[PDB]
Copies of this chain bind each other. A is one copy, B any other.
Amino acid sequence: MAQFVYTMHRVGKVVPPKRHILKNISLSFFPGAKIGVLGLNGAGKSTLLRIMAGIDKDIEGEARPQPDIKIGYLPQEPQLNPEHTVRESIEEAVSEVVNALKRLDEVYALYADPDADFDKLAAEQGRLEEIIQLNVQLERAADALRLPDWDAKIANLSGGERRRVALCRLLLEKPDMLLLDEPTNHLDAESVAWLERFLHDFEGTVVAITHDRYFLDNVAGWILELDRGEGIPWEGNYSSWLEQKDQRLAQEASQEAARRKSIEKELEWVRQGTKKGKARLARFEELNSTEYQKRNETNELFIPPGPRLGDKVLEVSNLRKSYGDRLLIDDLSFSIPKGAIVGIIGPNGAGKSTLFRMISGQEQPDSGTITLGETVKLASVDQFRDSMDNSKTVWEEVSGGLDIMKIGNTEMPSRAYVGRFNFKGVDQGKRVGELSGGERGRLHLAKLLQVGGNMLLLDEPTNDLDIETLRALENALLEFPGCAMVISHDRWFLDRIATHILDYQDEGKVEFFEGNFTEYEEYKKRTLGADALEPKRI
């Protein structure tokens, strides 16, 4: 099990009250790897090294070092024996070799005893000489790190003097793995350069918490960033990490901008700047511009344009439909202008969804006529969000595995089309079952609008959406070149986009009106008198 010098599985650390300084840390460490540990103060960098040291065992998950290796650890604040001298503290580091020399003098002294076994002496002496690979080395190391005099008490030493001693011991022990917490503190520039050289040529594994960018750029072959107490391994040095950090910031800036834009659209409406269909039908041609729609592609939600709509879209004449013994619609007539967004309201079971199924040709009227224009291509999106297999992902659900989809008449990357429904790269592998009813609503929308129709029949797309999606949807629809008919009980949504209203009343009565929800209610009140808006059913 030497393939990894250290492993962590779901490692965490809780500090009272219940704060986690680290969470879900799953990482593998390779022998010889040189890793720089980055992260803001409080990201748990130091705790992480204490765990690898074997000092902190009170953790979640499992933290295992390679078996039978030497681990050296440098805390931020050195731990030395105030009574020892510098000489003695350093000599503790080379105990392994000092003990060899002592044993070797014994072996040599054993040669003079007639009961000694030559072969065993010579063999052990050989095994002792094999280990050696001193007083001059210590002097050499001592100079390198500017150590205080050999005779100095640890007590008398400064904090920086103690650090240099602790550092020198560690390097002289030559462990398999060096764990370094801010090793450049209290050192001078040429010493740091010397340290970098040592760390660079060091044959074992180095995990260093440091701000020193020459370390990170010239030694570090991996950057381990700690953020929310979670680990972000990055393969490469400081420079390439820095480039990655920049792109990540540019992405973040891009995502908030897209969404600051969505919010500002609603703000204009709110300010207010009204009083979008007294204007919508007039500027229809402006929406049908190819260059114009190409700019809306970076909007939070972007609905694909259908084929160009003609003047005649939907003509319904004396429409009549019943279900069982219940009259749903009687004598309904209307024409839908191109560009119109028609909000549909009324009590459930009034036959609202039934109209869609009839325009769609899934059901037949009992009487009357429904006529669509020859340029009309329907996109129906029913109210259900139910998945037969909620183990599939957002992207699998929409694409069916296709990398390239024909969205309407146009081929395009499925990833891009999915992204145009505010499903970011990181969200596309989320399973359907893992999504919120809101998100299940965006997905249902994303899946079914792939047909690229210029006439959208949306049955309650708004029922379960969160505010940001509702706003993005409103905005997307205000930009959509074709027609939409939307069954909804969201009044703000209706007032923002609707050019017309179909109002289902009891006994098969259906009222058609030009305006939004609020305009309709006032008109209904104005004509039916007060108590008109007060709902009434059983």
Which A89-140 residues have a C-beta within 8 angstroms of B?
Answer: none
B489 touches A146 (CB 8 A): no
Residue A489 contacts which of B149, B184, B436, B463 (CB distance < 8 angstroms)?
B184
Copies of this chain in its oligomeric complex: 2
A281 CB contacts on chain B under 8 angstroms: none
A267 touches B249 (CB 8 A): no
Who on chain B is nearest to A160 by CB?
B348
B250 touches A260 (CB 8 A): yes
A412 within 8 A of B: no
A203 CB contacts on chain B under 8 angstroms: none
B211 touches A465 (CB 8 A): yes
CA distance A186 to B383 in the complex (A): 11
A175 within 8 A of B: no
A369 within 8 A of B: no
CA distance A160 to B464 in the complex (A): 13
A347 within 8 A of B: yes
The number of chain A residues touching the other chain, given as a range, is 35 or more
Chain A, residues 497-538, CB within 8 Å of chain B (1/0): the string is: 000000000000000000001000100000000000111111
B270 touches A246 (CB 8 A): no
A191 touches B246 (CB 8 A): no
Who on chain B is nearest to A161 by CB?
B348
Q: Which of A14-22, A282-290, A448-456, A476-484 contacts B (4 or more CB under 8 A)?
A: A14-22
B188 touches A489 (CB 8 A): yes
Tell me, rounded to whole Å, the shortest Cβ–Cβ distance linking A528 to chain B: 12
A249 touches B256 (CB 8 A): yes
Besides the known contacts A18-B18, A191-B347, 20 further A-B residue pairs in the complex with CB atoms under 8 A apart? A18-B23, A18-B60, A38-B467, A41-B439, A41-B466, A144-B534, A144-B535, A146-B347, A146-B537, A148-B538, A188-B347, A192-B489, A194-B533, A211-B438, A211-B470, A212-B491, A214-B491, A249-B259, A253-B253, A253-B257
Q: List 26 A-B contacts (CB under 8 A).
A: A18-B18, A18-B23, A40-B466, A41-B436, A143-B535, A143-B538, A146-B536, A146-B538, A149-B538, A160-B348, A186-B348, A187-B489, A188-B346, A188-B347, A189-B489, A189-B491, A190-B346, A191-B347, A191-B489, A191-B535, A194-B535, A211-B438, A211-B490, A213-B490, A214-B492, A246-B267
Residues of A within 8 A of B (CB): 12, 14, 17-18, 20, 23, 38, 40-42, 60, 142-150, 160, 184-194, 211-214, 217, 239, 242-243, 245-246, 249-250, 252-253, 256-257, 259-260, 263-264, 266-267, 270, 345-348, 436, 438-439, 463-467, 470, 488-494, 517, 521, 533-538
